[PDB]
Amino acid sequence: IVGGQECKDGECPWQALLINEENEGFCGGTILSEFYILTAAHCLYQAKRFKVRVGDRNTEQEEGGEAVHEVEVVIKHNRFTKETYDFDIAVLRLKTPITFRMNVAPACLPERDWAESTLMTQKTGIVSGFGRTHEKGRQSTRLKMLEVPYVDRNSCKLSSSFIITQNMFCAGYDTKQEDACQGDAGGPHVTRFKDTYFVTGIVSWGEGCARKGKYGIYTKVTAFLKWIDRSMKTRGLPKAKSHAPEVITSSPLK
């Protein structure tokens, strides 16, 4: 059985660790381009500051000149429920552009068409994250990314007492072992579809993280196309080249 194997130092770029100015992290992000970083909204709201660094495979140590991706300010989300969890997706507005390196690989943008062909075929998936969703007693220093299968939708509304909508569904094993709150919050649940890579999941805590061996909670960005499109074209062309690209927007994500 494939257990909790760590991420490779080659094809594992999607890991924008969201830390603070001091020696204390909180959650992580998702690398797709150079103007938007998908992550959970509770990463910044009801938390602390925001410090991002892409290509950072270790928090305590450093692999040289690679972790650099500072963030100026940040906003929230319209459908983000403060009490529970629903469409928990937030965009990190970086301040310095970063080119495409080895540990920083871009990814193609998702679309609404990959919603009926990606969930019925790829019944598995990987959860990239340093391990900050369940920061209780498993804080591993190495970037871990285990494999979790996909379960039917009729077994996800009862995994947690909160009623889950369509945006989030099952993405873990059965009620056997620990398969929830894996990685950092806002962690990319990218599923290798076919010749490309499209992220389709964000791990967030619902009622926290305790004895959650049932199922996991991961979003679906295929329906989030109308939000990543309204926050990319309405902001206009990059003024000072990713300032803010562009953090000067309304709170409900336009």
């Binding site: 319209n78 459908r79 429920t81 529970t84 629903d86 009623i163 109308k226 309204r230």
Partner: peptide
């Protein structure tokens, strides 16, 4: 969804 719609609890 720029305001309030369905599945907005």
């Amino acid at each position: 969804v720029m305001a309030t719609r369905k599945m907005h609890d």
